[PDB]
Homo-oligomer: 249 residues x 4
């Protein structure tokens, strides 16, 4: 049938951007989708788009940095659809731009709490549900900056590195428990947030991608979909680039 | 719809093991498939199975280590089907088992010729054809041993590292010429091959089992399709966690 | 001549284990050494040993996880010796042993605070001082678990990956400001810590033994010296081959 | 004493460049040094410089791509100084510049034979001598291009990747045989060959190094020296960058 038919999938930060594209891919492939976001209007709109494709979805408001919200979100998924098969830990921020020496303590803490700690809180409660329902598959949203530096964004690079480590650890630990965990590392993707950067800055970013363009959110979602499906059944603890060659040079 | 419908795909060493699984997946997804192998019977058998699923496939006998054979194989694909869209460089051998100091000069050269030089010969002629076609996609078959050692198989490990480097170079070079190149790194896979050695192998995979050729083929398919359009120059493990520890 | 003569060096967690070995090597090579630790007796003991070799050393009590303590430690170094040339961010803990699903919220936060956030707090204030001095060198203590998993220690593995990322960022950012930053990745090291578990650990190192803290310290020394002048943003294993397989 | 006192060290391609700098470092540190190169005049000059520092050295002409020359070179080292403790497999060429599709078959073969096969031939005969004399230490000269692409130099990138694999394999295999093997990955280094590139091309290279300059041969030699000494006794099968941050971004 459709490759995610009969599965229940959760996407954090699915109000916008990559998370939106992943939630739509999940919906189109027959998953029952739980949308989570800080922004309710964005989240409800994602639900409405999935429903308008003929999929099934619900919205639950949660801050990814809160342990209690992550626990509650998994609780809601299981209450609503009876199980949790697939989680995409996508919620994240870019953070302030400053050299490491000048990086604010609060700005640091915020990036680490959302982009790193929050991914762990998600995984922890997701794992608990997945163990109950016979296993599952987690996709953690990392970055190219999980492996290469992003000057002026030390907290982002550090957090995305930490997500790659966490992913390896979960994959290794739950190998024989039927839970797989993998990390996706996108290059620079054309979002609305990108339209806020200056055009000169955008050309420079483009020049760093051998493919000669920015990526699209749908192109990342294709990889997430794969890694979320049964097709990727021998793939766990891995890190998978979608970067137009950025890390190849 | 079939994700490779109307594509022309070539798989090297597609008479058995992973290459067979790749050719079958390509065939199932509607590609016209060129099977290449040093063993005609195996290759002919692969063609027959694709035909029995209702796909289209031809066999061309070739030694991967030979530049002329690679050029002739690609020439054959373009002549028979009008173009080349997809190539999987799969053909390889394990080589003799010896410590590096004891590795025979002839055994060394044979593994390098098939597993390293041959992948380059394939890619070179594949690229040439794809540029005439307006682009294409290559998947190179590496290994976990493209990133971690295989004691007693230094030639294999070296050649599989080389394939990763070559892949990065092609992906970076042809980014704006609409050719993508990626490498797949399988863990140990259950194929016709001592049970204590097998248990030692399984113990190295956190997933707790050896992989299946079909599991490898799924990743190759994804990487050969337009779904992977923003992926190039990358190395993609299918190893049940082997390299994560 | 002494390769660190007249340099001012700070080592975190230098009351025992690798940090002690690093501080001793720094002391032997003529640095003025600031010892930091949460345990005063251990720290005071380290100072005494450097003094008995004829080096110069002071102790400053600090919790690595605290931003104020890190700023005060660096302030202390600059006040006592006039400048900061070298820093080694070594302080870390192993954390509780649990599967990720079972990892306690408090245990998680403690490991992240010391091993990840604390290294950043150290680097931030160290960088500030070094820029006033016209440059400097940082060595961050990562692990093999900055690149491969440690089952039951997900917080440790995550934090050690973070340290590698931070190191890359600092090295890249301050390349033209004469500050270098590199990370060291030790394998399992013989320190005061079940013999079957120990044998399992040794079996994972191709060299066939656990490392010694002095072996780790030698690499840190090289990376702290002017001999490593073209090395920055790099991750450097000292692991008896652990990550090569 | 001097850190390589009483050791016998071999450097291939020590007539010029990095190999020259490594041979001088070895000599200054009290090693007995065997210089090998295709160019006799260059090689004899290196010997003369080592002797003028008060070191001991001899020259033996060998093509690194020949198994017989590598065997003979090790034979000469052992005949002359009684043993072989340290080998630096440095001989290498840059190769032609062409896209992979356009890369010549003969140009490919030549780069692979010198930069890769020749390193194996060296290691093989070095290992044989080192096993006889109770162990030793090999340093294989790789590149940044052992891990990242060099567009237009596919054979070089491929070969340098292969050297990293070979290194890991030797380190793993001989761990308990008292032979260590490690690979050095230099960024772009100021050689005379570099003066043959155009100045615009040189600025572009510089811009790719965060440190904001090209490297010096002496800076690579310092790392090789370390990895050749007893100080690096717990380091084997590793890959060690000297790249001014090139691979960090
Ligand atoms: N170029 C790129 O956009 C790029 C590249 C690599 C990686 N990524 C990663 O992709 C992920 C998605 O980013 P995006 O580009 O789609 O950004 P975006 O800002 O378009 O989408 C982020 C979404 O996350 C939500 N969110 C933010 N903080 C949250 C929190 N605490 N709890 C819940 N929801 C929260 C936002 O409201 C928003 O809907 C992030 O993890 C980012 O690091 C993006
Ligand atoms: N455990 C695994 O099986 C494993 C793991 C990692 C990577 N790989 C890689 O997967 C690829 C396929 O191997 P496999 O396991 O399916 O082995 P296999 O021996 O079953 O299949 C290899 C095929 O290649 C053919 N072949 C060999 N040399 C050839 C040449 N010179 N020219 C043309 N055809 C040639 C053989 O006849 C055979 O059909 C290889 O590149 C191998 O290195 C395999
Ligand atoms: N097998 C190994 O020992 C091994 C392997 C890889 C990496 N490492 C890393 O090496 C570093 C040193 O560890 P070790 O093996 O020497 O362990 P250790 O426990 O012997 O030494 C660590 C020291 O840090 C101090 N310390 C701990 N938390 C502190 C804090 N918050 N503030 C200040 N001081 C604090 C302790 O009192 C102790 O003196 C750590 O970062 C560890 O993660 C160790
Ligand atoms: N920017 C750089 O220069 C750079 C960067 C990274 C890696 N490397 C590597 O460093 C090594 C040394 O290169 P270099 O920059 O000093 O170049 P170079 O041309 O200055 O020195 C190379 C030396 O090797 C000798 N040689 C060449 N082929 C030989 C053969 N077949 N047998 C014996 N000797 C031979 C040459 O005669 C010469 O003396 C090479 O392996 C190169 O790939 C250099």
């Amino acid at each position: 049938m459709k490759i995610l038919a009969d599965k229940v999938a959760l996407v954090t930060g699915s109000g916008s951007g990559i998370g939106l594209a992943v939630a739509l891919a999940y919906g189109k492939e027959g998953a029952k989708v739980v949308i989570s976001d800080i922004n309710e209007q964005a989240g409800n709109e994602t639900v409405k788009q999935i429903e308008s494709l003929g999929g099934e979805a619900v919205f639950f408001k949660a801050d990814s940095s809160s342990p209690a919200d992550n626990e509650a979100l998994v609780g809601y998924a299981v209450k609503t659809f009876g199980r949790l098969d697939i989680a995409c830990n996508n919620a994240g921020i870019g953070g302030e731009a400053a050299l490491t020496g000048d990086y604010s303590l609060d700005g640091w803490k915020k990036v680490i709490d959302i982009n790193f700690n929050g991914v762990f809180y998600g995984c922890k409660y997701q794992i608990e549900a997945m163990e109950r329902n016979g296993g599952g598959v987690i996709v953690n949203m990392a970055s190219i900056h999980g492996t290469v530096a992003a000057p002026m964004s030390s907290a982002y690079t550090s957090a995305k590195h930490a997500v790659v480590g966490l992913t390896k650890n979960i994959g290794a630990e739950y190998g024989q428990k039927n839970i797989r965990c993998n990390a996706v590392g996108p290059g620079y993707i054309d979002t609305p947030l990108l339209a806020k950067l200056d055009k000169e800055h955008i050309n420079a970013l483009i020049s760093k991608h051998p493919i000669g363009r920015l990526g699209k959110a749908e192109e990342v979602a294709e990889l997430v979909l794969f890694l979320s499906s049964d097709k990727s059944s021998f793939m766990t603890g891995g890190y998978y680039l979608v970067d137009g060659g950025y890390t190849a040079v």
